[PDB]
Design a protein around this ligand. Sequence first.
Ligand SMILES: NNC(=O)c1ccccc1
Ligand SMILES: NNC(=O)c1ccccc1
Length: 165
Amino acid sequence: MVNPTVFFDIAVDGEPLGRVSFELFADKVPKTAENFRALSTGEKGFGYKGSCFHRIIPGFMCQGGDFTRHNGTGGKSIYGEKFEDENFILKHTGPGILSMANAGPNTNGSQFFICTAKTEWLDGKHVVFGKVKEGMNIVEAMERFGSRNGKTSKKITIADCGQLE
Ligand SMILES: NNC(=O)c1ccccc1
Ligand SMILES: NNC(=O)c1ccccc1
């Protein structure tokens, strides 16, 4: 069956920036794809709507998904506990790759990152589960609000999000 597509509507200090959409590789990493899909639709009662990208490092990645502590210390999966690395079949091949942030082996929650370059040193440590489909230019625009230590100069939020048909 067809890989799900998800959208994020991004804002910058509350002003709309644009829409980023993602293909989720449910064919390769179903548990991981399903956690991100469900957190994007908010169908379990919690998820990414209203959350922020808290750590953005230009030339590297944009990291988000901490909807409980807003700083990289929090977040939770849909499974009632952190979950295992599903596989490492897919690699960090370039800009647009969507991959799980974690605290080491088998500690996936809800935090994720969008690569803005090839980051092959993350292969085998972070589960790749999707890719930007449309709106890579919005991620490039977001990136410009990061910094060398990752602190953002403006608040970058997921004003809206959901699943696309
Ligand atoms: N907790 N941070 C992470 O899992 C991470 C993810 C991607 C790049 C660098 C760090
Ligand atoms: N899981 N990876 C991390 O927490 C990390 C954070 C900062 C730099 C490199 C790696």
